[PDB]
Amino acid sequence: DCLFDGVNELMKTLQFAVHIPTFVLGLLLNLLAIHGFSTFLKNRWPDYAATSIYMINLAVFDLLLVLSLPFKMVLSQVQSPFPSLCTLVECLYFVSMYGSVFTICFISMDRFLAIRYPLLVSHLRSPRKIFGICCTIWVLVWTGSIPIYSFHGKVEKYMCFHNMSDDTWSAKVFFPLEVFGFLLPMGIMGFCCSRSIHILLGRRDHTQDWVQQKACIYSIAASLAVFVVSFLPVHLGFFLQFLVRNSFIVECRAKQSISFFLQLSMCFSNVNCCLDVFCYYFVIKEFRMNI
Amino acid sequence: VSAEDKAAAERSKEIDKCLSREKTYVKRLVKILLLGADNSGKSTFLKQMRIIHGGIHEYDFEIKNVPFKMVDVGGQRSERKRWFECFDSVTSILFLVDSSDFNRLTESLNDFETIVNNRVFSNVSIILFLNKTDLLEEKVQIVSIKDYFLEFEGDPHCLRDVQKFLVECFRNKRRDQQQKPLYHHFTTAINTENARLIFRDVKDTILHDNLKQLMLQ
Amino acid sequence: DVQLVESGGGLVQPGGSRKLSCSASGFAFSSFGMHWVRQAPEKGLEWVAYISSGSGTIYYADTVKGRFTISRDDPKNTLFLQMTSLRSEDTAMYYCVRSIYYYGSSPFDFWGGTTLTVSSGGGSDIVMTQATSSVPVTPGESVSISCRSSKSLLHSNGNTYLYWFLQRPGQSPQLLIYRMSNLASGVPDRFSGSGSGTAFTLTISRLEAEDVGVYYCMQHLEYPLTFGAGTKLEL
Amino acid sequence: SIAQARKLVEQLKMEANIDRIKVSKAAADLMAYCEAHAKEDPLLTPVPASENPFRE
Amino acid sequence: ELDQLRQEAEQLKNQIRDARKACADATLSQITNNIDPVGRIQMRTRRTLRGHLAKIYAMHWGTDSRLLVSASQDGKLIIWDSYTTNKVHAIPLRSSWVMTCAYAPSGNYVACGGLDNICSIYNLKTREGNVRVSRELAGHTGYLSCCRFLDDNQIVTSSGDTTCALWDIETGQQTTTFTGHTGDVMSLSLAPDTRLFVSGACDASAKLWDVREGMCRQTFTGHESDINAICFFPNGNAFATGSDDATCRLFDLRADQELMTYSHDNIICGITSVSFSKSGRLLLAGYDDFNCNVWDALKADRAGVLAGHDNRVSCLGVTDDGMAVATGSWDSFLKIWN
Numbered sequence A: 001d002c003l004f005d006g007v008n009e010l011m012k013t014l015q016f017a018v019h020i021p022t023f024v025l026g027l028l029l030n031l032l033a034i035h036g037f038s039t040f041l042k043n044r045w046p047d048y049a050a051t052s053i054y055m056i057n058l059a060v061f062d063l064l065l066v067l068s069l070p071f072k073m074v075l076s077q078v079q080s081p082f083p084s085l086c087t088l089v090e091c092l093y094f095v096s097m098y099g100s101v102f103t104i105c106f107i108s109m110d111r112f113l114a115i116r117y118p119l120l121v122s123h124l125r126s127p128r129k130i131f132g133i134c135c136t137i138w139v140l141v142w143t144g145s146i147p148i149y150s151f152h153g154k155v156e157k158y159m160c161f162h163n164m165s166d167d168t169w170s171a172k173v174f175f176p177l178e179v180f181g182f183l184l185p186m187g188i189m190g191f192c193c194s195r196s197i198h199i200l201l202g203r204r205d206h207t208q209d210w211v212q213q214k215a216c217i218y219s220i221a222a223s224l225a226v227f228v229v230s231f232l233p234v235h236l237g238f239f240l241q242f243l244v245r246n247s248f249i250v251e252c253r254a255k256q257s258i259s260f261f262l263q264l265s266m267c268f269s270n271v272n273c274c275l276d277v278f279c280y281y282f283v284i285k286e287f288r289m290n291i
Numbered sequence B: 001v002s003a004e005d006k007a008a009a010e011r012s013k014e015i016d017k018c019l020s021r022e023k024t025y026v027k028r029l030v031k032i033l034l035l036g037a038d039n040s041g042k043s044t045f046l047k048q049m050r051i052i053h054g055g056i057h058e059y060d061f062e063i064k065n066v067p068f069k070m071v072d073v074g075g076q077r078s079e080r081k082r083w084f085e086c087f088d089s090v091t092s093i094l095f096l097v098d099s100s101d102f103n104r105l106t107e108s109l110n111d112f113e114t115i116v117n118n119r120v121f122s123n124v125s126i127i128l129f130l131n132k133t134d135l136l137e138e139k140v141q142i143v144s145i146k147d148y149f150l151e152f153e154g155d156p157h158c159l160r161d162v163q164k165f166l167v168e169c170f171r172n173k174r175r176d177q178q179q180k181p182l183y184h185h186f187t188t189a190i191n192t193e194n195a196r197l198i199f200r201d202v203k204d205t206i207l208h209d210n211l212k213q214l215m216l217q
Numbered sequence C: 001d002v003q004l005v006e007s008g009g010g011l012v013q014p015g016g017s018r019k020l021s022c023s024a025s026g027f028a029f030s031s032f033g034m035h036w037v038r039q040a041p042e043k044g045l046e047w048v049a050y051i052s053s054g055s056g057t058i059y060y061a062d063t064v065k066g067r068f069t070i071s072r073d074d075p076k077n078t079l080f081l082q083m084t085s086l087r088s089e090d091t092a093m094y095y096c097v098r099s100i101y102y103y104g105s106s107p108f109d110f111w112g113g114t115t116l117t118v119s120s121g122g123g124s125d126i127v128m129t130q131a132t133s134s135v136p137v138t139p140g141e142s143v144s145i146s147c148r149s150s151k152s153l154l155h156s157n158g159n160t161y162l163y164w165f166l167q168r169p170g171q172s173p174q175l176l177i178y179r180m181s182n183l184a185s186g187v188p189d190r191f192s193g194s195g196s197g198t199a200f201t202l203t204i205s206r207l208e209a210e211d212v213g214v215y216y217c218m219q220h221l222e223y224p225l226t227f228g229a230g231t232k233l234e235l
Numbered sequence D: 001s002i003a004q005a006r007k008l009v010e011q012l013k014m015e016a017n018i019d020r021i022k023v024s025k026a027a028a029d030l031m032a033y034c035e036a037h038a039k040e041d042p043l044l045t046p047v048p049a050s051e052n053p054f055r056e
Numbered sequence E: 001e002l003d004q005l006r007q008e009a010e011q012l013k014n015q016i017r018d019a020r021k022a023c024a025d026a027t028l029s030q031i032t033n034n035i036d037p038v039g040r041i042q043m044r045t046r047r048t049l050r051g052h053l054a055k056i057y058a059m060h061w062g063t064d065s066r067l068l069v070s071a072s073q074d075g076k077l078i079i080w081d082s083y084t085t086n087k088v089h090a091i092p093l094r095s096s097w098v099m100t101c102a103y104a105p106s107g108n109y110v111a112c113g114g115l116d117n118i119c120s121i122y123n124l125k126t127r128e129g130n131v132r133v134s135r136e137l138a139g140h141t142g143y144l145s146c147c148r149f150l151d152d153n154q155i156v157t158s159s160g161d162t163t164c165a166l167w168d169i170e171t172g173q174q175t176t177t178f179t180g181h182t183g184d185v186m187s188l189s190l191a192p193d194t195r196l197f198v199s200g201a202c203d204a205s206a207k208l209w210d211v212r213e214g215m216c217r218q219t220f221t222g223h224e225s226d227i228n229a230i231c232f233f234p235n236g237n238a239f240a241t242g243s244d245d246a247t248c249r250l251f252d253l254r255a256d257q258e259l260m261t262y263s264h265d266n267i268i269c270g271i272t273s274v275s276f277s278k279s280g281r282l283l284l285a286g287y288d289d290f291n292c293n294v295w296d297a298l299k300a301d302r303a304g305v306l307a308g309h310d311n312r313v314s315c316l317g318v319t320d321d322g323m324a325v326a327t328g329s330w331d332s333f334l335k336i337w338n
């Protein structure tokens, strides 16, 4: 009724071939990003302090995912020396993923708020509030991971990312995870990006210099496109694997393909650690002038 | 420290509290440097604004609970650097032009070029008010625009063509265009919608500042 | 004209309560610290309370601590002293004193007066001693008044917080010398102030009939503010 | 025109009538003043921290 | 007749230049060549005076070398205790466009002025305990650029109307007017003896005036741009001036000509302020490049730099005892250096 041997070996080959270049590229890309935005923080604080803080936050989450990647590559094909090392590696990896997701969402919401309410944001926006929001993001991801990974005691996983228990995949835990990690973030991101673009396009009525902000429109559109490409298929695979676990898709060759798609999409989801750099940091003229 | 030193430190702390209290207000204050001319209708425009909304001359008013400060430097207008850098932190410059008087356009355009091309006013937006538009539309039929501007192309008696030509000549004087927005309005001093237009332009300038802060490009 | 007018004093039974008020006019009351100073009948000055220009710090004398309350109403320019459980030792004449505190200011430069009478029904404190109680002298002849402090009033910042006051018969005290050397505004140059770390002298070059009264030395080095016994000066 | 020209000519004549010492004498006097007061300049010679009321 | 007057003026200028050249025999650099260098000077920010809400335009030390007054674009005059950083007074101004301030030598008054064309006198020792305006000197048709007290009753102001004026504060009228500058007067310095004062204007010239007689004693023209600052040598026989041409210059009264030029190739920004140390050995100049340069006044060598401000250094000041230096900047901060 089921078999996942060839799927597992093909996925091992593909995950090596995708995660090695992803690790290598993301390492230097995020180190360069952190260096550049730290230079901005120490050089041009009054005008770029609030944005640089959450840019560094996103870069640090991406770098944490990059550093957890080699453990994912090795531990998924070799026996775990300790029973709980797999849980720690998984926690670091997924906390990095979802912290990056929430940082991206907060960036989009900040941009939309600044565009839609320029006076209020000009009065209220400050580096300390952005720093507090970043701290809240870190606290939320890290204190949401613990109540989830505490139940991974009955898993009995000799290799990581292979043996997930019906504690996080039950509806009462799976569906809130999907809603609060993908569905709500994607809805917020789509609304915020679309409204920002609509408002920036509506400036033809006030001034003929609205064409100066076409690049901002392109950047926001690229942010939406990169978010959808990097995080939609992986959660589609999560939902599909949920359907397999609940016997909605039971006939063979469909469970194997769903597992292969889930693993491959999770491998390609982590490419966002470089797509984030290209989408948020290299679009900045000053950042690319520094580099 | 002694008791009198402690009490002096208390007095300094109270002064600090007053200064910090006043700091919030000055952050939300919008300063506009008025640079009209004698024929531009500056006096009538200011009188209308004062009626509707209740050295150097200053006019303080409020639009949508936003404190506005119009600085009038009529007469006491200098060309030295020190005088100019006094206004380097104003939000925008309101340039008033009599659009009907075709004879004086060249001097007005030269003054506009000198004002908007100053490196001091690089972080301020420009609000251009072409006053006496009724006189302009009465004069366009009688007098051809091509007489004073051979570069004008279009129907001499078409009001829209003349307005477009005036706006283009004023916008073309701005050598550097990718720094701050420029806004132009065709209105009259007696018009009661000038404050709304000024507030809209200031809101767009602040939106531009917010966009620059976000490092979106 | 600067004026401090006090009211609320009167005959009070022991254990009762009273509220002294002081209306301030002719000066910026909000920027001045205020002191309450009382003088028992046929006795010297005794500081009782202090409230700063705002209300951040409030100081009381140990004798009135826990019983007296000092307060101010800046919009009304009024100073208040709420007394409770009054004893016979509270019978005195209470004055309020302006005291502004910045570099070069002159604290204790204006006084008032009001009288409270109650019916029949300190360690670390700096001791200020005026050796002579009465100096009989004639007009036109120079006089010198001495005062001694147990602790050195000179501070590491270079100031010597010693004050001289003159109280003419039937009049409120007026500042003569502030910080041991500085002449108060409106005081004739015939008054001079000299002293050392612990010993101080006040010299009057040419005696006049207006100089007759009691001279007080007060320290402002630390609270509580303590006065000398007072030296009389009569013809 | 003529009045301002006469005024400026008179001013120039007043400027020309002054007696000017040699540049060497002025330089020597400036050096002598600087050398005489060198010991009394706190900025030129950093004073000991004890005699500094601005020590932080 | 006009051509004859122009020719006479040109001949007088040529004769003055010839006399100045004849009196020039040996340069100050040659005379001071054998003197040992001052050496590198490293002053540090001893205090930072914060509290202003906008750019600081002017500052003046009190004669006690402890109190100073500062003028800022937020329409505020603040008197500081430099030793303790404490704020003694905070004086609101009717006009926020202040450009100069002064401290009376007695410490009883401060002066204010700017784009309102009025020199305002504020009384600091009032029986009411508050600072109130004591006098409003009007009569200048241009903005006020500098003001300096002679005593409690006399003050000298410079204006953008190309004139300087001596005022009697009690009557409020100009006792004397000083004319001859063809450009906006930017700065003025009083001689230590108070008998003379020197002025620098936008016509790239410096004029020495006699306060009593009221006429121009001498004119100095070596700069190629607007003069923004001017200061007297401690003995009163020389003065230094800084201009927009990225150059400071020292002029001698008796020699009636320039003695030394303080400039560097790396320096292209204009000079906002100049000041001498107590002995006159050090000339401190403020620049638009956010830094203050310490010059050896005798050797024209940059002996040090004060770099602690995030914006343009607008004002400078050395105490009467020479112990400290105050620097004001457009970043709304005052710094005491040592």
Ligand SMILES: Cc1cccc(N2CCN(C(=O)c3cc(S(=O)(=O)N(C)C)ccc3N3CCCC3)CC2)c1C
Residues within 6 Å of the ligand: A090, A091, A094, A095, A098, A099, A141, A144, A145, A148, A160, A161, A162, A163, A164, A168, A169, A173, A174, A177, A181, A238, A266
């Ligand atoms: C914010 C945060 C922090 C840490 C973990 C998570 N969470 C919950 C725990 N996590 C899983 O059970 C999980 C694991 C894997 S797999 O890679 O290890 N492998 C294939 C079995 C795949 C999907 C997973 N989940 C996503 C849907 C529900 C379950 C990962 C996502 C979150 C949302």
Ligand SMILES: *[C@@H]1O[C@H](CO)[C@@H](O[C@@H]2O[C@H](CO)[C@@H](O)[C@H](O)[C@H]2NC(C)=O)[C@H](O)[C@H]1NC(C)=O
Residues within 6 Å of the ligand: A155, A156, A157, A158, A159, A160, A162, A163
């Ligand atoms: C997933 O869990 C199963 C158990 O649910 C693991 O299978 C065990 O494998 C060990 C050796 O690794 C055997 O000793 C046990 O008998 C097996 N148990 C069962 C119930 O078959 C399996 O190895 C785990 N897979 C991974 C990839 O860690």
Ligand SMILES: CC(C)CCC[C@@H](C)[C@H]1CC[C@H]2[C@@H]3CC=C4C[C@@H](O)CC[C@]4(C)[C@H]3CC[C@]12C
Residues within 6 Å of the ligand: A098, A140, A141, A144, A147, A148, A172, A173, A176, A177, A180, A181
């Ligand atoms: C994405 C991160 C930062 C947010 C984490 C919060 C959400 C997604 C997770 C974290 C822990 C989860 C809970 C874990 C356990 C329980 C108890 C169970 O009886 C009902 C479901 C419930 C209550 C889960 C609902 C979803 C939940 C609240």
